[PDB]
Design an enzyme around this catalytic site. Structure first.
Site, short mmCIF file in Angstrom:
data_model
loop_
_atom_site.label_atom_id
_atom_site.label_comp_id
_atom_site.label_asym_id
_atom_site.label_seq_id
_atom_site.Cartn_x
_atom_site.Cartn_y
_atom_site.Cartn_z
NE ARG A 120 60.91 -14.88 -14.81
CZ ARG A 120 61.99 -14.29 -15.33
NH1 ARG A 120 63.16 -14.88 -15.38
NH2 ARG A 120 61.91 -13.07 -15.82
CG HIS A 180 63.02 -12.52 -21.63
ND1 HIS A 180 62.29 -13.67 -21.34
CD2 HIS A 180 63.93 -12.34 -20.63
CE1 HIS A 180 62.75 -14.13 -20.17
NE2 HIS A 180 63.74 -13.36 -19.72
CG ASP A 181 67.17 -13.71 -21.18
OD1 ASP A 181 67.32 -12.46 -21.31
OD2 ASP A 181 67.01 -14.31 -20.10
CD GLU A 201 66.16 -16.21 -17.44
OE1 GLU A 201 65.12 -15.54 -17.68
OE2 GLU A 201 67.01 -16.46 -18.30
CG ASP A 244 65.41 -11.51 -12.99
OD1 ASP A 244 65.70 -11.71 -14.20
OD2 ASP A 244 66.09 -10.82 -12.19
#
Ligand SMILES: OC[C@H]1O[C@H](O[C@H]2[C@H](O)[C@@H](O)[C@@H](O)O[C@@H]2CO)[C@H](O)[C@@H](O)[C@@H]1O
Ligand SMILES: OC[C@H]1O[C@H](O[C@H]2[C@H](O)[C@@H](O)[C@@H](O)O[C@@H]2CO)[C@H](O)[C@@H](O)[C@@H]1O
Ligand SMILES: OC[C@H]1O[C@H](O[C@H]2[C@H](O)[C@@H](O)[C@@H](O)O[C@@H]2CO)[C@H](O)[C@@H](O)[C@@H]1O
Ligand SMILES: [Ca+2]
Ligand SMILES: [Ca+2]
EC number: 2.4.1.19
Length: 686
Positions: A227, A327-328, A257, A229
């Site tokens: 994943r 988490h965002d 992301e 970032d």
């Protein structure tokens, strides 16, 4: 092995991801806990360490928590060595519990565990059929202050304990020294710092090679996916060069992301997803699900639109990772809200197209605002909640019902509050009904499906007030009432007699690499695989089963191809398109063109002699080029992935709409490095 096996690192579509913040899950090993003013065992201060680790993860896996739920993959915090400094952000102390502040990518964060802890993690997971994904954040190091070297660890970067360099006195130029971004343009948030985070410079060879080597280690450690970032904050071409490195070594499913706001739809986002070599977190799905089921700022018609549009915008929609929170954002569940919303949205996500990701503690109805508030400690491991049972009942269908994992999506009934969709793949069908209206039932008449004649029980067992369905001839459903807050799933499965491709991965690689072709009805004897018009059979086909095929990419010319299969009897499958054959190993090169002056709504692009450059096709030119930060207009630049060591001919062009203007003279020429990066600087020939 079958497509659904834990060993399939190229397809996550039949899986259900569980997103974990290591620190906040479970502390199975207090001994590695930090000490002093960085630790808070009560975890009341959401900015320090709470002590969750790998061990804790192993523990939850072994005691049935995750497996009981139906989860089949776990996504965890970046495992690399973070900084040790406690940072005071105006009275508040902040630790690197999140793992986003890297100091050395070849070492672990001792608060999470040792490498041996890591290896155990993968082992335990694997043993229980759970795939492992990790966060990777190559955009930067840590918060740094160029003139206050004493601040934090000054964004210092190490290579296995060896000091590479710091943010202050950056002579090697490992970092960017352009100031901070104002998130104003794409170009602006790429070449500047994200706040005070030391921006890595992917154009420096050291950095380039270091990162490419670091990821191999982890790959060698057995991870199942990555994943990425801040993909939107690094150069696209570099990232494509990173992808190539992964795929040309040990391919694994990778997603990045790229944050999208409410109602935001970006073409850049689509393009990245379509050509970079990785897929993305489906922010568009997320935002829209929230508006509809949570904030009530849009209706069914809006969901429907996002569904049909995304299907068109993404070449590989089934590789986009869906979710309802992460988490965002604030936790989907609000303190005082009806739980049925969170439940309906889970059901929805679970039976929808893509790769569903569940944020840890969702099943426990956790509440919480933005960071740090959405990062609390999971308060319980109860399997008794309604949410836990929802997941438990639906997750497994991704493995047993290919309609869900790989099928098309189709609206069959709708109004402002209701939505009935059909998923279909081969002789498999799934029908989902959702009635967002928590206060009013709905009369459902005129429903037609592809379900065979008969009666169907709600797969949820009535858990969300679903009901049975009666399909007559012509798959026409008889009238029924859909309870307020009602959700029902009905399905039909059966053997597929014809080869039907459901997925391919990786989607971009050089010849010689083995790719994975998942589906149904491939039969048991080796058939033939087509890459364009080229046929592949025999030895090169490393394995063949009914649901999966492993084949080496033939040595064809760099480009885009359609894939197709034919069984032993010669029956051909559907086509799967957009496969990219690289021209070879890739390097990242910065192209710079001097004095290319344009007129408004006219940009410069790049094209040339290799597939990576469009092969002289202007509809496939690279660009538009950047012109504000690194080089100022009328100079233009751009970081591009190209075949390593190849001699390349190219030219710049000005496009406007589909109206093109070529540079005059003769092609420019260059030879890409064998490794590392390079900068080619030229002037526009009129
Ligand atoms: O009869 C097929 C018809 O079914 C669905 O249409 C629904 C419509 O969505 C509801 O709002 C309501 O008006 O009943 C219709 C069925 O009579 C599909 O949406 C529609 O496209 C399809 O033709
Ligand atoms: O910022 C990118 C921008 O660059 C180009 O526009 C030039 C324009 O052609 C010049 O005449 C001058 O005014 O500066 C502009 C850039 O600041 C492209 O024409 C434009 O589409 C693009 O957005
Ligand atoms: O079509 C392939 C051809 O593309 C490029 O040729 C350009 C040429 O440079 C321009 O001056 C303009 O005249 O259009 C041509 C495209 O038809 C490459 O220069 C050339 O090598 C290549 O064969
Ligand atoms: Ca611990
Ligand atoms: Ca950056």
């Amino acid at each position: 092995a079958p497509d659904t096996s834990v060993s399939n690192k190229q397809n996550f579509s039949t899986d259900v991801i569980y997103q974990i913040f290591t620190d906040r899950f479970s502390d199975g090993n207090p001994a590695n806990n930090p000490t002093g003013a960085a630790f808070d065992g009560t975890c009341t201060n959401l900015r320090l360490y709470c002590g969750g680790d790998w061990q804790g993860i192993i523990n939850k896996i072994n005691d049935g928590y995750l497996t009981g739920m139906g989860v089949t993959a776990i996504w965890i915090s970046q495992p690399v060595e973070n900084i040790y400094s406690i940072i005071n952000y105006s009275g508040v102390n902040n630790t690197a519990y999140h793992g986003y502040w890297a100091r050395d990518f070849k070492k672990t964060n001792p608060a999470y565990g040792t490498i041996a802890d890591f290896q155990n993690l993968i082992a335990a997971a694997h043993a229980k059929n759970i795939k492992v994904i990790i966060d990777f954040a190559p955009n930067h190091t840590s918060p740094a202050s160029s003139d206050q070297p004493s601040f934090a660890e000054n964004g210092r970067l190490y290579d296995n304990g060896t000091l590479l360099g710091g943010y202050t006195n950056d002579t090697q130029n490992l970092f960017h020294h352009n100031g901070g971004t104002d998130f104003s343009t794409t170009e602006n948030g790429i070449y500047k710092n994200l706040g005070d985070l030391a921006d890595l410079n992917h154009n420096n060879s050291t950095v380039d090679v270091y990162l490419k080597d670091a990821i191999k280690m982890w790959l060698d450690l057995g991870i199942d996916g990555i994943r990425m970032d801040a993909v939107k904050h690094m150069p696209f071409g570099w990232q494509k060069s990173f992808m190539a490195a992964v795929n040309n070594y040990k391919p694994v499913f990778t997603f990045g992301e790229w944050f999208l706001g409410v109602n935001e739809v970006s073409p850049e986002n689509h393009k990245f997803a379509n050509e970079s070599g990785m897929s993305l977190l489906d922010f568009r799905f997320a935002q829209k699900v929230r508006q509809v089921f949570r904030d009530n700022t849009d209706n069914m018609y809006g969901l429907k639109a996002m569904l049909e549009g995304s299907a068109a915008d993404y070449a590989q929609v089934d590789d986009q990772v869906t979710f309802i929170d992460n988490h965002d954002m604030e936790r989907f569940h609000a303190s005082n809200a009806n739980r049925r919303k969170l439940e309906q949205a889970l059901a929805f996500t679970l039976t929808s197209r893509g790769v569903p990701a569940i944020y840890y503690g969702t099943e426990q109805y956790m509440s919480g605002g933005t960071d740090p508030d959405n990062r609390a400690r999971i308060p319980s491991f109860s399997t008794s909640t309604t949410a836990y049972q929802v997941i438990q009942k639906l997750a497994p269908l991704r493995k047993c019902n290919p309609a869900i994992a790989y099928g098309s999506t189709q609206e069959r009934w709708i109004n402002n509050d209701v939505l009935i969709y059909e998923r279909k793949f081969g002789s498999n069908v799934a029908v989902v009904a959702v009635n967002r209206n928590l206060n009013a039932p709905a009369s459902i008449s005129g429903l037609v499906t592809s379900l065979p004649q008969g009666s169907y029980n709600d797969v949820l067992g009535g858990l969300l007030n679903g009901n049975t369905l009666s399909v007559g001839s012509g798959g026409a459903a008889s009238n029924f009432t859909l309870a307020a807050g009602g959700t029902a799933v009905w399905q039909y499965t059966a053997a597929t007699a014809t080869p039907t491709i459901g997925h391919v991965g990786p989607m971009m690689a050089k010849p010689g690499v083995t790719i994975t072709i998942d589906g149904r009805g491939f039969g048991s004897s080796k058939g033939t695989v087509y890459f364009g018009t080229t046929a592949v059979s025999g030895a090169d086909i490393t394995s063949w089963e009914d649901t999966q095929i492993k084949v080496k990419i033939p040595a064809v010319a760099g480009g885009n191809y359609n894939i197709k299969v034919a069984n032993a009897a010669g029956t051909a499958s559907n086509v799967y398109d957009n496969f990219e054959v690289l021209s070879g190993d890739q390097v990242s090169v910065r192209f710079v063109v001097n004095n290319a002056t344009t007129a408004l709504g006219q940009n410069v692009y790049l094209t040339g002699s290799v597939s990576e450059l469009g092969n002289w096709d202007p509809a496939k030119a690279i660009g538009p080029m950047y012109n504000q930060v690194v080089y100022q207009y009328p100079n233009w630049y751009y970081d591009v992935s190209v075949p390593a060591g190849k001699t390349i001919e190219f030219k710049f062009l000005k496009k406007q709409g589909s109206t093109v203007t070529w540079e005059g003279g003769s092609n420019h020429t260059f030879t890409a490095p064998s490794s590392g990066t390079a900068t080619i600087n030229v002037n526009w020939q009129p």
